[PDB]
Amino acid sequence: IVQNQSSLAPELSGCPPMGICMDGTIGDPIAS
């Protein structure tokens, strides 16, 4: 699938879908 890096980003983030985890902490921005 063609997509740019910002499209792929939520699927790599440790805290999807926007980069803030359920507990209000953030990222590892690339967790996989």
């Binding site: 997509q3 910002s6 980003a9 879908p17 980069g19 209000g24």
Partner: protein, 466 residues
């Protein structure tokens, strides 16, 4: 030499030569140093449409995303080709108005609402429930033209965005774009500034806040997850202070392309045009390149059909004279290559005659019993346009001289005076002073009450022997 200095000054009014289609490239043959920075570009063509300006979408990212046949660009539907908004000169007074198909009942502030391009939420990964793209966006019936406030907590969200998309993009430059890098990202949700209410402070990639936009957060504490309850009132950029004029506003667009998501078949956002407000300093990115749409299928002011596009067209009014339509590819030398915001009071367009005199240009056409504002408006509407369909309307006129019946056009009567509009397609070389005239270009604002003098280097005595 005054003659040389005059020619150098008058170059700023040569709209077909200077209102060009440029793209950024460090190997481009064109250059200009503005402040501490040398900008480099290629000029693909001249004479870009002023009323409506388009060129083919140019994507020099390594993946060339938005050049793909599967990339959706809003102009494919409305114009018939994948076009980006183009034209190197800032266009003063130009606003994208929402109208009926005949241009009536125009709304010149509707554009400030966000778009509904069926993008947000882009992902709902890990959320308790799913939602289709579009679910978080402002209702179609209130859709405007403004780009989404932001996407993810910051841009570049990860180092792959920066290193695989941004740095290897031939239009990107890390110095010009030093406010959207790995080490200095552009913040949407600034997690370095927590609050008692939430673990971040909300900003935006563009704008100064207060607008109707998509519900980025959703109703739950899991940020970004469904359900949504738009509209959400936007916040402003964390730091807009460096955006001091229309060219700086274009830089915000240039640098933020890769902040937006693209997946095959979806909208591909690149080289976005923008609105700059001279009075407030607000720079607002537009989500759509379309400048005119008036087909039988266009939606008149309100619709629920998310596959429809609204009837819109460019408009200038006296009241819109604080606004500037800015393309992503604005030339950094625009102050000396493009017309200024204000009409020119008490002068008439001319060409040099016998070395040290000026004779008026030869009118292509005239309009009788018009106001000065009408002169500027019709000049704009009769200037130039890309996209084919308006060719029967535009005439190639980029300069007009308004001659009031009996008003000094530097006095208070200027706003209501009637007179004659003379339209020209000849490049001007000088100006003639007159008490009862005002000079417009197709890129000028149209409020006669803000008119100012040209540089006196332009003005020569009239050759009255012609």
């Amino acid at each position: 030499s005054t003659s040389t200095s005059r020619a150098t000054y008058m170059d700023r009014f040569n709209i077909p030569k200077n209102h060009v289609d440029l793209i950024w490239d460090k190997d481009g043959t064109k250059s200009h140093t503005r402040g501490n920075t040398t900008y480099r570009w290629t000029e693909r063509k001249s004479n870009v449409g002023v009323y409506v300006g388009y060129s083919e979408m140019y994507d020099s990212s390594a993946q060339a995303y938005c050049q793909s046949s599967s990339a959706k660009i809003d102009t494919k539907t409305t114009v018939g080709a994948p076009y980006m908004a183009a034209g190197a000169c800032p266009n003063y007074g130009k606003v994208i108005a929402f109208t009926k198909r005949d241009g009536s009942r125009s709304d010149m502030t509707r554009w400030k609402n966000e778009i509904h391009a069926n993008v947000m939420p882009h992902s709902t990964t890990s959320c308790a429930s799913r939602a289709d793209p579009g679910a978080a966006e402002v209702a179609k019936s209130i859709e405007g033209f403004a780009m989404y406030a932001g996407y993810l907590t910051h841009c570049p969200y990860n180092v792959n965005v920066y290193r695989q998309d941004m740095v290897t993009d031939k239009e990107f430059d890390s110095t010009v774009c030093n406010f959207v890098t790995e080490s200095n990202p552009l913040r949407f949700l600034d997690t370095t500034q927590r609050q008692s209410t939430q673990p971040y402070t909300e900003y935006a990639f563009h704008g100064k806040g207060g607008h109707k936009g998509y519900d980025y957060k959703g109703q739950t504490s899991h940020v970004g997850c469904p359900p949504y309850n738009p509209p959400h009132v936007t916040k402003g950029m964390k730091d807009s202070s460096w955006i001091t004029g229309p060219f700086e506003c274009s830089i915000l667009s240039r640098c933020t392309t890769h902040c937006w998501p693209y997946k095959s078949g979806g909208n591909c956002f690149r080289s976005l045009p923008a609105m700059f407000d001279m009075s407030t300093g607000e720079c607002r990115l537009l989500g759509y390149h379309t400048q005119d749409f008036r087909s039988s299928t266009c939606a008149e002011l309100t619709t629920d059909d998310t596959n429809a596009f609204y009837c819109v067209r460019p408009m200038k009014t006296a009241a819109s004279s604080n606004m500037v339509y800015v393309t992503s590819h604005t030339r950094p030398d625009h102050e000396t290559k493009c017309p200024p915001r204000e009409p020119l009071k008490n002068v008439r367009w001319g060409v040099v005659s016998k070395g040290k005199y000026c004779k008026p240009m030869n009118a292509r056409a005239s309009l009788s019993n018009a106001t000065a504002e009408q002169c500027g408006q019709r000049l704009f509407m009769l200037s130039s346009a890309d996209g084919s369909s308006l060719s029967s309307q535009v005439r190639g006129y980029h300069w007009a001289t308004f001659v009031a019946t009996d008003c000094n056009m530097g006095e208070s009567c200027a706003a209501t005076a009637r007179g004659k509009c003379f339209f020209y397609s000849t490049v001007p070389e000088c100006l003639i002073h007159s008490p009862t005239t005002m000079a417009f270009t197709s890129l000028s604002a149209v409020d006669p009450s803000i008119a100012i003098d040209p540089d006196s280097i332009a003005v020569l005595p009239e050759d009255k022997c012609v």
